[PDB]
């Protein structure tokens, strides 16, 4: 692993992120003042859990599609067998969506960009999932305090996906090598940018993991009775 190779991996991972980040940072920021009105919030709260579930399902399905496209552009991911690609994505795609979410989160007023405007967590009341929604807002509140840059999100979410400890992998050594390469790139870039300090402030991978298991359990109990077909890209 030469300096030139490490830096090419850095630049490469950051390019794939730039091409598959669903929402441009500039828009998210300039729309921070565009907040749902009290009447609009009441409108979301009056919807049935079934309508709200299908709006969130569509929103999450779309975001997962971008995370999948992100993975496919990661050096070496496509050279993995189909089984390992699926294992990695099934275990990590929703964790990455939760990480990316902090870009759309405004720590000042505790609102998130959702269907065109910023709203607090009371927007999702109809789902009857206050505790879980609150946990998701707290998680992205923590990441916002770190001031995650776009390249830190790119490199960190690459490491969420490329994890040689996911059970079910058939080529563990090949994933281990990809993982260590990405760890090198991530650590090298933090040094270049003077951001060593965030390693210890990052959440433990078990925090993100537990958050997504509670997520998917409610996810399946919802889709068990209300399926939907979404678009592509
Ligand atoms: O698990 C449940 C659940 C219900 C709703 C959300 C949910 C949906 C949307 C948002 C706002 N988004 C976050 C993702 N961000 C992606 C992104 C960000 C930045 N750049 C590119 C892409 C766009 C903004 C927040 C939360 C959820 F996460 C889980 C429940 F808890 F209710 F049970 C379910 F499904 F069962 F209903």
Author numbering: 265 to 497
Question: Which text from the study accompanies this structure?
Answer:
RORγ is also a key player in the immune system where the lymphocyte specific isoform RORγt is a so-called ‘master regulator’ of the IL-17 producing T helper (Th17) cell subset. The results presented here indicate that the RORγLBD requires a ligand to stabilize the active conformer and that hyperactivating ligands enhance coactivator affinities by allosterically driving electrostatic intramolecular interactions between H12 and H4.
More recently, RORγ has also been found to be the driver of the androgen receptor in metastatic castration resistant prostate cancer where the selective RORγ antagonist SR2211 elicits a potent cytostatic effect. HDX-MS analysis of the selective RORγ inverse agonist SR2211 revealed a distinctive profile. Specifically, RORγLBD bound to SR2211 exhibited protection to amides surrounding the orthosteric binding site, but SR2211 offered no protection to H12 suggesting that the activation function surface remains disordered. The co-crystal structure solution of the RORγLBD bound to SR2211 reveals a deactivation where the carbinol moiety pushes W317 into an alternative conformation that prevent H11’ and H12 from nucleating. These findings are consistent with previously observed pharmacology and show that HDX-MS measurements can distinguish agonists from inverse agonists.
